[PDB]
RNA sequence: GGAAUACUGCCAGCUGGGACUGAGGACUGCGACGUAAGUCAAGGAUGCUGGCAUAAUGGUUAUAUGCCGCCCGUCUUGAAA
RNA sequence: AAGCUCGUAUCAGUUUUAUGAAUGUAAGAAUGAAGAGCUUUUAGUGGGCCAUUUUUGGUAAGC
RNA sequence: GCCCUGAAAAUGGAUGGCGCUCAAGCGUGUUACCUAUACUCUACCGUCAGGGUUGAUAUGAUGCCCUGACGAGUAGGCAGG
């Protein structure tokens, strides 16, 4: 079975994936 | 003959707290049958006694007391705020507290 | 009761008076309970005492009738 | 209120029921739950039967014996459930599940004494009419509990020996509801009514 | 909760251009100021203007004509989503223009996740005659003598401990 | 006063609070039936007679009924029940504050009891069950929620 | 003098508002010339400008 | 055709219930009420009453419960280490 | 920190109008501050990491 | 739009737990309530600023006052004990 906790390295390694999607759209 | 009760029987719930930090000066009291803040307003400022036996006799009675006042309401359920002279013990969380009918407004 | 669709206030009143529902309504053990809740709620402390006193008598007559 | 509030699972929702049964001990409230086995839940069966085994597997490594012990018997099933919302471990906790008691069936001395329910938690009254809903009994069994019957059987007994009771009572009343009826309408009475009674 | 606001605006009268065109639109909002704020937003979608370039001439509330009558409401709605925006129409059997647009907004949230910022209400109109009613769940009440029950009635208790074991007839 | 102050205490500022006479809550009209909430006579039904100079109330049971003498009592330690008697037959003006000093019961005090009581009993005898009502003790019974209760 | 001054002020907006609807005209409400402000966010994490 | 009534807003409208507080220490000041004499809720609490000396009360220590509390110092490195 | 002149119209991480190829100069523009400038000297200081906003080079991406 | 599918293993495992299904989930709206060393008010401490005060004050003018604001802090500085 899989988990439903987000580990913080992921929970904040989502923000740092989402930021990369912001700078990608502009260019 | 059966009753000599001139008080409403509430229970001592907690100290007013947070998630983390309790202040023990504000004891939270549930009273019997009271459901709203509206029904509670009546009880505001009546004297409460918490009553208990202790081991040793003091004044010809093993039966000690603390005294205090309902001060304001708490949320909606009618749980009410209450301050005693000496604070109530915490070990008594979920114990009976006799709430009285003086001082009357009625 | 008989009422047309979308009936107005005057028209409602007429038919309400025609069916005379309040008399029908207060005749039920349902409305009688609502009254019996309300009427008890407004007892005086002394008037409540009387009730105890009567219910002392009404019991004696009742427990007489039984065990026969 | 009442010092002991013998509840009764029979159509409640393990959860909810719990919660409240919980709060109530925390606020110093001697409870006692009965007919555990006729407790219910939410969802199909072939679920609770999961949302469980999983639970089962759990258990400890190096030493299986020392670990998450998987109780079968209803009662307990539901216990847990509850010893799970009560900081159990801390005086005030222990001091609770101290105040608790959860029998399957409804053995003496409780047989003989009124029980009750907890609105705010009946299948009938919470589950959108007609929806999958499991019923411990099976769900226990399905995974160990060896008695479903004993209970059952050594049940039917109770029900009997009671209803019987009932009657005798229903018979009794009737008489009253009759005496009062007749010796009702004489003054005294009247009066009362005025006040209401 | 909502109210309907009749608003008119006219892009401040410049030299040689005295008294311009006046743009009337009925805006459902919660207050006069949300209303005004919404008004300019719609102005920027109809043509090229700005909030500072124009003026709110007159903003007045509208009450419902007969709020003891039950009408049926055919509503045109433009709304944005994850994709590009798209026109719509639904029907609402209701009392008041305002309670109609209200109950529509709940439905627009529930089904399509769209919030008040996204939705333009295009036009709300009473439908007078039946058969112009194009939706089934509205036509469903437009039958002669509709007598039905509400089975399985939840009686909300205040007290936690009930002794009766609650039965739900009605 | 003749003795000059041997030590330097500063005198008070000229304090601005005049004592105004106490305004009693609406329900109290002399010759009212009361419950005492605190004291030796907690839980008794008791008749109101006169408001006093020390913001108290002069009350008797009367004594021949429930065993409550002529007593002073405090305004808040009482619930005022709606049942009113006739009180106008009673002479009450004899008793004021000074009537209650002490510097085994005084034979003077018991003489004033019986003058009041017999001039009172008469009026209680008019109403049904009142003589009985007064002799009984007030208490709360299970399900008496006193925010609901009417007195 | 001021009590008369404010009263007559609001009454002659009222009347002037009533005058536009009677005469079919439109009444421009006099531009707001005074604001009250209140700080709503705390002292930290506020940008310099 | 005729009233209302909700809603919004006002009152230097009236009448209650509860908690917390009582700084200061002759008088000066701004006032209000009164025809005046004076009085007052006007530059911060006064009045009455009760409890005691085999006291009242207050404290110390030992635990109990509730809630919170990473091992002190030094030295790096962007802080944890 | 001391000394001298002031105590002001001495200025401001601010807006506006005016005048040129986000951004320069002025105000008999606004708002805010009685805390400014001139001497003389005297400690401590030469760590980066993260985020934001413009870009610049970038291929599976990341950056 | 919600739902299932839209692959990830290997010590038992986590929406934080229990548990939840006309929710205790999703979307939205309305109100009520809970609480920070935040804000308001009062007292107190201290510091800073502005002042009063002598033919001398019912206390050391290096006294005794009145008003107002303010109070994190390492290296470092200044001062009182």
Curated annotation (Swiss-Prot), chain A:
The biased composition feature labelled Basic residues covers 1-8, 16-27
Q: Which domain of life is it from?
A: Eukaryota
Q: List the disulfide bonds.
A: none
Q: Membrane spanning segments where?
A: none
Q: Where in the cell is it found?
A: Nucleus
UniProt record similarity statement:
Belongs to the TRAFAC class YlqF/YawG GTPase family.
Further information in the entry reads: Present with 7130 molecules/cell in log phase SD medium.
Query: What free text does the record give on domains?
Result: In contrast to other GTP-binding proteins, this family is characterized by a circular permutation of the GTPase motifs described by a G4-G1-G3 pattern.
Q: What does this protein do?
A: GTPase required for 60S ribosomal subunit export to the cytoplasm.
Q: What is this protein called?
A: Nuclear GTP-binding protein NUG1
* First and last residues shown, out of full length: 6 to 32 of 520
From Swiss-Prot, chain D:
Task: Tell me the domain of life.
Answer: Eukaryota
Question: What PTM annotation applies here?
Answer: N-terminally acetylated by acetyltransferase NatA.
Which terms under GO biological process does the entry name? cytoplasmic translation; maturation of LSU-rRNA; negative regulation of translation
- Please provide one cellular component term from the Gene Ontology annotations of this protein: ribosome
InterPro entries in UniProt: Ribosomal_uL13, Ribosomal_uL13_CS, Ribosomal_uL13_euk/arc, Ribosomal_uL13_sf
What's an example of a GO molecular-function annotation for this chain?
A: structural constituent of ribosome
Alphabetized SUPFAM superfamilies for the sequence: Ribosomal protein L13
The cross-link Glycyl lysine isopeptide (Lys-Gly) (interchain with G-Cter in ubiquitin): at which residues? Answer: 175
Which terms are listed as keywords in the entry?
A: Acetylation, Cytoplasm, Isopeptide bond, Ribonucleoprotein, Ribosomal protein, Ubl conjugation
Gene3D superfamilies in the record: 1.20.5.4280, Ribosomal protein L13 (3.90.1180.10)
Report the locations given in the UniProt record.
Answer: Cytoplasm
The protein's role, per its UniProt record: Component of the ribosome, a large ribonucleoprotein complex responsible for the synthesis of proteins in the cell. The small ribosomal subunit (SSU) binds messenger RNAs (mRNAs) and translates the encoded message by selecting cognate aminoacyl-transfer RNA (tRNA) molecules. The large subunit (LSU) contains the ribosomal catalytic site termed the peptidyl transferase center (PTC), which catalyzes the formation of peptide bonds, thereby polymerizing the amino acids delivered by tRNAs into a polypeptide chain.
Concerning PANTHER family, the annotation shows: LARGE RIBOSOMAL SUBUNIT PROTEIN UL13 (PTHR11545:SF3), RIBOSOMAL PROTEIN L13 (PTHR11545)
In the UniProt entry for this protein, what further remark is given in the free-text comments? Present with 43300 molecules/cell in log phase SD medium. There are 2 genes for uL13 in yeast.
| Similarity comment text for this entry | Belongs to the universal ribosomal protein uL13 family.
Do you know which HAMAP family this protein is assigned to? Ribosomal_uL13 (MF_01366)
Q: What is this protein called?
A: Large ribosomal subunit protein uL13A
UniProtKB/Swiss-Prot annotation, chain F:
Q: Report the SS bond pairs.
A: none
Swiss-Prot/TrEMBL GO biological process terms:
cytoplasmic translation; ribosomal large subunit assembly
* A GO term from the CC aspect: cytosol
**Has UniProt tagged this entry with the keyword Plastid?**
no
List of residues that carry Phosphoserine: 6
Q: Which key words tag this protein in UniProt?
A: Acetylation, Cytoplasm, Isopeptide bond, Phosphoprotein, Ribonucleoprotein, Ribosomal protein, Ubl conjugation
One matching Pfam family is Ribosomal_L6e
Protein's cellular compartments: Cytoplasm
Q: Single GO molecular-function term?
A: RNA binding
Which post-translational modifications are recorded for this protein? N-terminally acetylated by acetyltransferase NatA.
What InterPro entries is this protein classified in? 60S_ribosomal_eL6, Rib_uL2_dom2, Ribosomal_eL6_CS, Ribosomal_eL6_KOW, Translation_prot_SH3-like_sf
Q: What is its main location?
A: cytoplasm
Q: What other note does the entry give for this protein?
A: Present with 37100 molecules/cell in log phase SD medium.
What does the UniProt function comment say about this protein? Answer: Component of the ribosome, a large ribonucleoprotein complex responsible for the synthesis of proteins in the cell. The small ribosomal subunit (SSU) binds messenger RNAs (mRNAs) and translates the encoded message by selecting cognate aminoacyl-transfer RNA (tRNA) molecules. The large subunit (LSU) contains the ribosomal catalytic site termed the peptidyl transferase center (PTC), which catalyzes the formation of peptide bonds, thereby polymerizing the amino acids delivered by tRNAs into a polypeptide chain.
PANTHER family, sorted: 60S RIBOSOMAL PROTEIN L6, LARGE RIBOSOMAL SUBUNIT PROTEIN EL6
Give the family per the record.
Answer: Belongs to the eukaryotic ribosomal protein eL6 family.
Q: What's the protein here called?
A: Large ribosomal subunit protein eL6A
| Natural source organism | Saccharomyces cerevisiae (strain ATCC 204508 / S288c) (Baker's yeast)
Gene name of the encoded protein: RPL6A
From Swiss-Prot, chain G:
Where it sits in the cell: the answer is: Cytoplasm
Please indicate which superkingdom the organism of origin belongs to.
Eukaryota
Miscellaneous comment: Present with 101000 molecules/cell in log phase SD medium.
Please report which protein family the annotation says this sequence is part of.
Belongs to the universal ribosomal protein uL30 family.
UniProt subunit comment:
Component of the large ribosomal subunit (LSU). Mature yeast ribosomes consist of a small (40S) and a large (60S) subunit. The 40S small subunit contains 1 molecule of ribosomal RNA (18S rRNA) and 33 different proteins (encoded by 57 genes). The large 60S subunit contains 3 rRNA molecules (25S, 5.8S and 5S rRNA) and 46 different proteins (encoded by 81 genes).
Q: What does this protein do?
A: Component of the ribosome, a large ribonucleoprotein complex responsible for the synthesis of proteins in the cell. The small ribosomal subunit (SSU) binds messenger RNAs (mRNAs) and translates the encoded message by selecting cognate aminoacyl-transfer RNA (tRNA) molecules. The large subunit (LSU) contains the ribosomal catalytic site termed the peptidyl transferase center (PTC), which catalyzes the formation of peptide bonds, thereby polymerizing the amino acids delivered by tRNAs into a polypeptide chain.
The name on file for this protein is Large ribosomal subunit protein uL30A
Q: Which organism is it from?
A: Saccharomyces cerevisiae (strain ATCC 204508 / S288c)
């Amino acid at each position: 079975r899989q988990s439903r906790r987000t580990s913080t390295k992921l929970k904040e390694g989502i923000k740092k994936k989402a930021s990369a999607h912001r700078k990608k759209e502009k260019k | 003959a059966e009753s000599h009760r001139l008080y409403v029987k509430g229970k001592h719930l907690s100290y007013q707290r947070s998630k983390r930090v309790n202040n023990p000066n504000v004891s939270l009291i549930k009273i019997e049958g009271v459901a709203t803040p509206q029904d509670a307003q009546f009880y505001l400022g009546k004297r409460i006694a918490y009553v208990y036996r202790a081991s040793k006799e003091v004044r010809g009675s093993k039966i000690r007391v603390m005294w205090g006042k309902v001060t304001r309401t708490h949320g909606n359920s009618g749980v009410v705020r209450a301050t005693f002279r000496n604070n109530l013990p915490a070990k008594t969380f979920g114990a009976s507290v006799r709430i009285f009918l003086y001082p009357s407004n009625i | 009761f008989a009422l047309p669709r979308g009936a107005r206030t005057a028209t409602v009143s007429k038919k309400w008076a025609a069916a005379a529902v309040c008399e029908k309504w207060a005749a039920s053990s349902w409305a009688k309970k609502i009254a019996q809740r309300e009427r008890r709620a407004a007892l005086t402390d002394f008037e409540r005492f009387q009730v105890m006193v009567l219910r002392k008598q009404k019991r004696y007559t009742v427990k007489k009738a039984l065990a026969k | 209120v009442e010092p002991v509030v013998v509840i009764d699972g029979k159509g409640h929702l393990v959860g909810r029921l719990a919660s409240v049964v919980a709060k109530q001990l925390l606020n110093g409230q001697k409870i006692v739950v009965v007919r555990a086995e006729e407790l219910n839940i939410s969802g199909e069966f072939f679920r609770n039967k999961l949302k469980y085994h999983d639970f089962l597997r759990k258990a400890t490594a190096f030493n299986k014996t020392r670990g998450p012990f998987h109780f079968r018997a209803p009662s307990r099933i539901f216990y847990k459930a509850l010893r799970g919302m009560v900081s159990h471990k801390t005086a005030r906790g222990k001091a609770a599940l101290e105040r608790l008691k959860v029998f399957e069936g409804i053995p003496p001395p409780y047989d003989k004494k009124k029980r009750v329910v907890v609105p705010q938690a009946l299948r009938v009254l919470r589950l959108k009419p007609g929806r999958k809903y499991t019923t411990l009994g099976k769900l226990s069994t399905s995974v160990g509990w060896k008695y479903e019957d004993v209970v059952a059987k050594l049940e039917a007994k109770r029900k009997v020996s009671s209803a019987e009771y009932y009657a005798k009572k229903r018979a009794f009343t009737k008489k009253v509801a009759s005496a009062n009826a007749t010796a009702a309408e004489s003054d005294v009475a009247k009066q009362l009514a005025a006040l209401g009674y | 909760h909502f109210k309907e606001y009749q608003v008119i605006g006219r892009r401040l009268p410049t030299e040689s251009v005295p008294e311009p065109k006046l743009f009337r639109m009925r805006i459902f909002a919660s207050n006069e100021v949300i209303a005004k704020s919404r008004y300019w937003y719609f102005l920027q979608k109809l043509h090229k203007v700005k909030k500072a370039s124009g003026e709110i001439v007159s903003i007045n509330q509208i009450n419902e004509a007969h709020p003891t009558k039950v009408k049926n409401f055919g509503v045109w709605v433009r709304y944005d989503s994850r994709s590009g925006t798209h026109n719509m129409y639904k029907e609402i059997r209701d009392v008041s223009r305002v309670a109609a647009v209200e109950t529509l907004y709940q439905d627009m949230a529930a089904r399509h996740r769209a919030r008040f910022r996204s939705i333009h209400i295009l036009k709300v109109a009473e439908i007078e005659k039946t058969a112009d009613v194009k939706r089934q769940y509205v036509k469903q009440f437009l039958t002669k003598d509709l007598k039905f029950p509400l089975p399985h009635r939840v009686q909300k208790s205040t007290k936690t401990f009930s002794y009766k074991r609650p039965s739900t007839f009605y | 006063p003749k003795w000059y102050p041997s030590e330097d205490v500063a005198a008070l500022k000229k304090t601005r609070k005049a004592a105004r006479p106490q305004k009693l809550r609406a329900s109290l009209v002399p010759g009212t039936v009361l419950i005492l909430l605190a004291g030796r006579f907690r839980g008794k039904r008791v008749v109101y007679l006169k408001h006093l100079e020390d913001n108290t109330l002069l009350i008797s049971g009367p004594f021949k009924v429930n065993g409550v003498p002529l007593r002073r009592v405090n305004a808040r330690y009482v619930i005022a029940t709606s049942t009113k008697v006739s009180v106008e037959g009673v002479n009450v003006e004899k008793f004021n504050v000074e009537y209650f000093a002490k510097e085994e019961i005084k034979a003077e005090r018991v003489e004033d009891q019986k003058v009041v009581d017999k001039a009172l009993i008469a009026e209680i005898k008019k109403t049904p069950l009142l003589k009985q009502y007064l002799s009984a003790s007030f208490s709360l019974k299970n399900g008496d929620k006193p925010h609901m209760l009417k007195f | 003098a001021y009590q008369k001054e404010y009263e007559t002020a609001e009454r002659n907006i009222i009347q002037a508002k009533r005058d536009a609807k009677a005469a079919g005209s439109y009444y421009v409400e006099a531009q707001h010339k005074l604001v009250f402000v209140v700080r709503i966010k705390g002292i930290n994490k506020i940008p310099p400008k």
